[PDB]
RNA sequence: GGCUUGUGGCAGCCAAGCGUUCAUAGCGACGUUGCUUUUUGAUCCUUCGAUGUCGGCUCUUCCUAUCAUUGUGAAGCAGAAUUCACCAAGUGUUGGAUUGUUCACCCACCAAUAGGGAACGUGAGCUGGGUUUAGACCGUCGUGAGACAGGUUAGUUUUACC
RNA sequence: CUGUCUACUAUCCAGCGAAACCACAGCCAAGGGAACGGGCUUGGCAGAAUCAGCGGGGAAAGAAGACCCUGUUGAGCUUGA
RNA sequence: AUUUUUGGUAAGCAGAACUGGCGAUGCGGGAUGAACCGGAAGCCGGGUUACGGUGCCAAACUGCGCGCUAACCUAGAUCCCACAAAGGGUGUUGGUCGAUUAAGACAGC
């Protein structure tokens, strides 16, 4: 019914520098740089500075927006929160090999930017997956048959994990019985 | 080794060929050829080393009035070997086998082509002279 | 397979809801199917387990 | 060909039941809503100073309500096989015995031997075995001439240069 | 499962030289319409003049349908009219 | 053809009642059409309308206003008319009747 004003605000930690211009949000922190283009959202992004204290706040509001339009405010706020978390602490995804008979052989290429799977269900085909920008994959030593994906962008790390998972789908078999694959087992922060 | 190369087909359906085995059949009447997907109006045709379905027109009563597999061992239609020499036999001949390719008889009366011997170990073992 | 790894794989392969109309694979807490061709049907059943 | 769709064919809805238990893996009784014009009917609008009347052969194209092939979801999916469903008409869907046959039924191969339209595609493209002139035989009917949604044999297929 | 060869045509030339047929004419999709358009409606398009074939269409030509029905039209034949 | 109406599953089927229309009739509108809407007509000038329209085709506003819809099925787009049903949707938009809640409503800790 076109609510007059829907508004939400988030606090910005002092250790992160943020810039907003034409719905283009730049996020800066010790771990690096992250960028996002929110031009597709018909919202008003404002950065509020408290002169006495100096803490930052990001306010996103929609004027005369419907429920569908208003649903994007929290989405944008969560995206900005994810950017802050990635630039301060980083993101760490953990994947585990599951197999019944044929152990899965993983070969990390140079730079920890690609992986090779060779013995999935005793298959002679070699599966190739390339890590996305800013995401590295390493073989865990303390945990048996575990892959660790680290990066600054949550979306890129999660998409790399999804690519690894989907590259090892079982076919022409009852997947309930044939449970072999590589699956995400834990989502966390590097720091 | 590898796989058989194509050779000229010279025995279309309804062809009657001599029976070179010891079963007792005198001739084999081809009714179809194994592995033929075919085309409209095109008669299925076999060559040396092919397995065909056939009936015995002259021979022992036990072998007549039924369908059995057979393998062609000789053909009169010339075919080209990979070395460029065209070769052919004096007559058309075949041997009765089971679906697995085992010879029903025990001996072959004449020579057999090298392709058939390479394809069917039992026929080669029962053969006298290859090529 | 270890019980923990078996459960981890089952989370992706077994714990699902199946749309009766279009057989679409859905998350275990799904109430309506996400597929357009079945009109987002609310007739869902659990994915059958091995017994 | 046109209207219609009773009939034919193809789908859906409810859920009493079937399915070792369990309505909905797979089915769906009692009821009930539809779609299609490759069935057959109903009608008689067009054609009787004539639109060549069966089938086969050849040739092209088109449809999907998908038989096979590509990619998928589901299962009373261990494997193998099978079944249900989803995108999907790009490619292919055969050689023979009997019958004029459409249809049917067998033999054989094959990945498969799916279903259909195009004036029930196509005779100045063929063929003419069948129907459907005149000859003739049989059976039944008729006093008879003759008849026959019965059988049989022989019976002219025209013309393009607009 | 077609290939090839010979003659005569077709073909091109000199000479010679008809006929059938012809409301006007001649590219299509759909619509409606006498329920299957070359013309009408809406679109697609559309560029002088010529040659050799071809059999999709012109619901092509050839005949005032011989089938069927009607007429208070016959005619060949039959009989218990 | 509106309404009344018989046989028939139905039919652009077949048959009746009143009235009107086409046939015998052009003209404006419905793209197109014997019957629908408007309206009936000597040959002309001017003005105004009927039905129907005013983004282009194409004469007349991209005129002044309020809401709804987003169609990844060819979204939808005007009597006759050139079709669509039963069942469904946690798509979205209004309403109706109920239940809990600052002695603190629902989800997670
Ligand atoms: K075949
Ligand atoms: K019907
Ligand atoms: K008629
Ligand atoms: K006629
Ligand atoms: K035939
Ligand atoms: K004769
Ligand atoms: K001349
Ligand atoms: K057009
Ligand atoms: K008369
Ligand atoms: K006479
Ligand atoms: Mg043939
Ligand atoms: Mg059950
Ligand atoms: Mg389909
Ligand atoms: Mg096809
Ligand atoms: Mg008598
Ligand atoms: Mg029409
Ligand atoms: Mg006449
Ligand atoms: Mg006459
Ligand atoms: Mg009279
Ligand atoms: Mg009126
Ligand atoms: Mg005037
Ligand atoms: Zn569904």
What is the residue-wise DSSP string for B56-116? BSSS-GGGBSS-EEEEEEE-SS-EE-TTS-EE--SS-EEEEB-TT--BSSS--SS-B-HHH
Candidates B47, B53, B42; CA nearest to B88 is B47
CB contact under 8 A, C1 and A96: no
Distance of B38 CA from E10 C1′ (whole Å):
40
- Which residue is listed with tokens 């299925």? B44
What distance in Å separates the CA atoms of residue A14 and residue A88, rounded to the nearest whole number? Answer: 11
What distance in Å separates the CA atoms of residue A150 and residue A95, rounded to the nearest whole number? Answer: 11
Q: Which residues pair with C22 in a beta bridge?
A: none
Candidates B37, B36, B32; CA nearest to B15 is B32
What distance in Å separates the CA atoms of residue A178 and residue A122, rounded to the nearest whole number? Answer: 13
What distance in Å separates the CA atoms of residue A83 and residue A89, rounded to the nearest whole number? Answer: 10
- Residue B108 gets the label, from left (phi > 0), alpha (psi -120 to 50) or beta, of beta
Which residues does A161 contact at the CB level (< 8 Å), separation at least 6?
Answer: A93, A95, A149, A184
The experimental method behind these coordinates is cryo-EM
- Which residue is listed with tokens 């030593």? A141
What distance in Å separates the CA atoms of residue B128 and residue C7, rounded to the nearest whole number? Answer: 65
Residues 1-51 of C with CB under 7 A from strand D: 16, 18, 20-25, 37, 43, 45, 47-48, 50-51
The answer on whether B18 is annotated among ligand-binding residues is no
**Cα-to-chain-centroid distance, residue B107:** 15
Between CA B62 and CA B72, with CA B67 as vertex, the angle to 5 degrees is: 105
Candidates B66, B69, B61, B75; CA nearest to B18 is B75
Both tokens of residue A162?
């999804």
Both tokens of residue B46?
């076999």
**Cα-to-chain-centroid distance, residue A80:** 12
What distance in Å separates the CA atoms of residue C19 and residue C30, rounded to the nearest whole number? Answer: 10
User: Are residues B41 and B131 in contact, defined by beta-carbon separation less than 8 angstroms?
Assistant: no
E strands, A13-143, are 17-21, 24-29, 32-37, 44-49, 56-65, 91-98, 106-108, 114-117, 127-130, 135-139
Candidates A161, A25, A38, A36; CA nearest to A91 is A161
User: Are residues C12 and A181 in contact, defined by beta-carbon separation less than 8 angstroms?
Assistant: yes
C41 CB-to-strand F distance under 7 Å: yes
Mutation to test the A interface, candidates C5, C6, C48, most A Cβ within 10 Å: C5
User: Are residues A8 and A59 in contact, defined by beta-carbon separation less than 8 angstroms?
Assistant: yes
What distance in Å separates the CA atoms of residue A45 and residue A166, rounded to the nearest whole number? Answer: 37
Helix (H, G, I), strand (E, B) or coil at A159: helix
User: Are residues A154 and A134 in contact, defined by beta-carbon separation less than 8 angstroms?
Assistant: no
Report how far ligand 20's centroid is from the alpha carbon of B53 (Å): 83
Pairing of strands B16-19, A127-130: unpaired
Candidates A185, A10, A176; CA nearest to A84 is A10
């Amino acid at each position: 019914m076109k609510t007059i004003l829907s508004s939400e605000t988030m606090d910005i930690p002092d250790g992160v520098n943020i810039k907003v211009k034409a719905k283009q949000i730049e996020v800066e922190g010790p771990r690096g740089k992250l960028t996002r283009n929110f031009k597709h959202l018909n919202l008003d992004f404002q950065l509020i500075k408290d002169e006495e204290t100096g803490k930052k706040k990001l306010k996103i509001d929609a004027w005369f927006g419907s429920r569908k339009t208003t649903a994007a405010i929290r989405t944008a706020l969560s995206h900005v929160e994810n950017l802050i978390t990635g630039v301060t602490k980083g993101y760490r995804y953990k994947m585990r090999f599951v197999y019944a008979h044929f152990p899965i052989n993983a070969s990390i290429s140079g730079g920890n930017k690609a992986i090779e799977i060779r013995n999935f269900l005793g298959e002679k085909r070699v599966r190739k997956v390339d890590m996305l920008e800013g995401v590295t994959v390493v073989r865990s030593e303390k945990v048996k048959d575990e892959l660790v994906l680290d990066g600054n962008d949550i979306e890129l790390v999660s998409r790399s994990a999804a690519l690894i998972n989907q590259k090892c789908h079982v076919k022409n078999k009852d997947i309930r019985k044939f449970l072999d694959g590589i699956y995400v087992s834990e989502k966390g922060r590097i720091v | 080794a590898g796989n058989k190369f194509r050779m000229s087909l010279g025995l279309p359906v309804a062809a009657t060929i001599n029976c070179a085995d010891n079963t007792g059949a005198k001739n084999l009447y081809i009714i179809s050829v194994k592995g033929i997907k075919g085309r409209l109006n095109r008669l299925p045709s076999a060559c040396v080393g092919d397995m065909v379905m056939a009936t015995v027109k002259k021979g022992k009563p036990d072998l007549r009035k039924k369908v059995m597999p057979a393998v062609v061992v000789r053909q009169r239609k010339p075919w080209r070997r990979k070395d460029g020499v065209f070769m052919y036999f004096e007559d058309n001949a075949g041997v009765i086998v089971n679906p697995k390719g085992e010879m029903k008889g025990s001996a072959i009366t004449g020579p057999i082509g090298k392709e058939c011997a390479d394809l069917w170990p039992r026929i080669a073992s029962a053969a006298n002279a290859i090529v | 397979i270890e019980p923990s790894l078996m459960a981890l794989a089952r989370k992706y392969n077994q714990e699902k809801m199946i749309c009766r109309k279009c057989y679409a694979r859905l998350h275990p807490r799904a109430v309506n199917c996400r597929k357009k061709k079945c009109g987002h049907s609310n007739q869902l059943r659990p994915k059958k387990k091995i017994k």
